[PDB]
Design a protein around this nucleic acid. Sequence first.
DNA 1: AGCGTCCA
DNA 2: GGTAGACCTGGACGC
DNA 3: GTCTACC
Length: 316
Amino acid sequence: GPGHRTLASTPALWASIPCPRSELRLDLVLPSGQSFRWREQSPAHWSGVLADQVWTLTQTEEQLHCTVYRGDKSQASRPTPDELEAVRKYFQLDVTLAQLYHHWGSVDSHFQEVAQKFQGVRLLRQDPIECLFSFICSSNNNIARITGMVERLCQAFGPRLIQLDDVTYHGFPSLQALAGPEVEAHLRKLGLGYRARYVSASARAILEEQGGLAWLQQLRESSYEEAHKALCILPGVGTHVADCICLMALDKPQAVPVDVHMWHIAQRDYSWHPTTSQAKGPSPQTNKELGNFFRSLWGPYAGWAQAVLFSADLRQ
DNA sequence: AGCGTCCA
DNA sequence: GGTAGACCTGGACGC
DNA sequence: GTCTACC
Ligand SMILES: [Mg+2]
Ligand SMILES: [Mg+2]
């Protein structure tokens, strides 16, 4: 198919959004385990599906440059202002990251040191369905493998969008696509392991037991506590996956995922131990205390601070 | 050499 | 509620 | 990382 675009080579097809590197580093956000659907198909150029369309993104010092492949047999043209607003919303650019970094660094000198090297790590605002099923796939697993599972899940069950070069892009599957009694066995052939049943069972639960797609909007409008509790009803969603979804798709900036990385960070970089449990290893009680510890330390956007340290820890 | 354990 | 261990997969890599 | 079973 047509080639993946670069900014320098097809300038007529790109438009910019004001966005300095202090506010965003694509290379520190897009491959760091928030979204699993972005690939650096050309040096410094990241391609993926954003609001039912394929986009390529690249940065200069003060601007985020965007191009869209509409794939409705229309003539090529640069993104419109309305189309760019979707990119703006996806990166939540109304939030000023430099001021959060200053606050987090002021209360936490360890954060300040890490942040000096890892500028521009912000939080994507993801589709709730894509976020839910991607993080169901993420549990007890590594980002490289998760990325392939999500890719194959979309290849098999999501709509075909367009082909660029050798890469056929697919939308994320609908709930209905994932709910049939045949889907589990298919997801097992696609290598999802025991999470195959979690994905299909969770799609069925939402459609059959929670009122369908509107439930996720209900949770977006609910409190952190209410949304986090409700998600845990789903098979494969425990407190950590629920926190991932709250933080990254349901607009709960205080939600703090606690995985193997955050637990190692707490022990190694903060010398933290639980004080609400005599036993100190990971458990429901100690994982809960650790999330509360990070909220007490970092404040209302603690989950965003978590994203900085998580992204940094992937590179060590 | 590549099996088998560790780990995400 | 606390605790322990099993669990799909496949890359890293010690031996 | 979540589930299931047992105390
Ligand atoms: Mg560039
Ligand atoms: Mg659950």
